[PDB]
A = this chain, B = another copy of it.
């Protein structure tokens, strides 16, 4: 293969550690309320600014291949943490560096870095246990706004708007975030099944106010094929006029004689029908019509395999919806009736799809957004006066959103970094099997102090004074680095979801403890 060059021992370790230390030093300035931003040059456009640890970490590759190895491993840590939790990234980075340094330094000739790894892993298991003991599950929706506001670097309006969206959509509902054109944030809430297709004919309109067709207690007909009929349409109308209900028809297109029947029966006798095009993109529309089928209760006509033909309809083959509103541009269906088991089955199917499907043909979320919650879906239109600002703010809101979900699903624990600090006594009551494992437990024991001391160091104060003052003080009190003084943590609102504190530590220790086991590194020649 490619010509290569190899390096042995603490010499090479010092290089990889140089890379780790560089990347960590770049990431760590963002940490906490008094943290600061990092500008990253973009190849094509104007530069990004970010406070996100992981986005800083991924941006830094290094010319020196060994230092680049270290860097790649640390950004591996920050990326794993961001994927598994969505916050706690800077923390995972500084933790990873601390474990890597304290690891590397303690190795000698007699030492056994694999066994030391075993010891640190023991120590982190023991720590996350005590973390779970410390966890108190979220209750009041004030705590939601607190977790959000703290994860958004002190922006109260962010955690307010997130609290509102999460209230109006539900704690495990769908919230998504995108750019506003407005200079301020907006919360929009959509309920139903909305998609961007409008009535084929103006003649379908019911209300002269808004120019909408508005229906309630309506039927739905779903056709995967065109309806140029053939009059495969008529039984579907006879069946509708029979039970005196309005009928909405969704199809690849509805035209030829079909449309003529539709707008003749609409304009003369006062029949209640609308026809709209399928959401429409090839193989995607098939999946969408199957979604609306499953949600509204009923079945899709045309070719899947077993073909259900339009001539032979039954009322149980249609669909049933609480309300429907259609305009020139878009169609919304509301309160559709079907098996809730079958719909949640469907959502469980699409999430497990998108999760494996590294495709970035992300309309699968547009599907997931469509097959609607419980209580609905929320769009977060972020404002600001400039694109770079918008990207910063949106990074922070995405962080706060992921943080709130982690909080509701696992728990909340003390902020500052105190949650990791309080776990040290749990390490003090450990029973190491040998010197190596003891070294590991010592490494974790030192490493736990780091996040709090770093948040304080960014404040411009003597962080390691503050860590020890916190340790001498009671369990409920910690350091408010923004206000610059000690306070009750949970009372003052400074709190972190337990899931992020767990995942940051687990990932960081997980990769760094493996890094410390290295004795020889092999790299490509420039």
Contact = CB atoms under 8 A, between A and B. Distances in A.
Interface of A: 1-6, 8, 16, 22, 25-26, 29, 33-41, 43, 45-47, 49, 56, 58-63, 65, 68-69, 72-73, 75-77, 80, 109-115, 153, 183, 200-201, 244, 253, 255, 259-260, 263, 269-271, 303-307, 384-389, 392, 459-460, 506-507, 510-511, 514-515, 517-525
A363 B297 CA distance: 40
Contact of A270 (B40, B305, B523): B305
A183 B505 CA distance: 14
A340 to B, nearest CB: 14
A515 to B, nearest CB: 8
A39 B385 contact: no
Contacts of A80: 385-386
A2 B517 contact: no
Number of copies: 3
A110 B462 CA distance: 11
B4 A62 contact: yes
Contacts of A260: 306
Q: Which of A63, A269, A522 has most B Cβ within 10 Å? A: A522
Contacts of A183: 506
Contact of A6 (B22, B37, B386): B22
A366 to B, nearest CB: 18
A51 B300 CA distance: 56
Contacts of A514: 37, 49, 386, 388-389, 392
A516 to B, nearest CB: 9
B59 A520 contact: no
Contacts of A110: 459-460
Contacts of A6: 22, 26, 60
Contact of A510 (B1, B61, B385): B385
B386 A519 contact: no
A29 B524 contact: no
Nearest to A107: B36
17 contacts: A3-B63, A34-B115, A36-B519, A36-B520, A39-B69, A43-B524, A46-B72, A49-B517, A76-B386, A112-B459, A114-B153, A259-B306, A260-B306, A270-B303, A385-B507, A386-B514, A389-B514
Q: Which are the 3 A-B pairs with shortest beta-carbon distances? A: A270-B304, A385-B510, A110-B460
Given A303-B270, A304-B269, A510 B60 contact: no
Nearest to A508: B385
Given A29-B520, A36-B520, A46-B75, 19 more contacts: A1-B59, A1-B61, A3-B61, A4-B60, A5-B63, A34-B114, A35-B114, A38-B519, A38-B520, A39-B515, A39-B522, A41-B523, A76-B388, A80-B386, A111-B460, A263-B306, A386-B514, A388-B514, A389-B514
A97 B523 CA distance: 23
B519 A200 contact: no
Contacts of A56: 520, 522
Given A47-B73, A80-B386, A269 B39 contact: no
Contacts of A521: 38-41
A479 B506 CA distance: 35
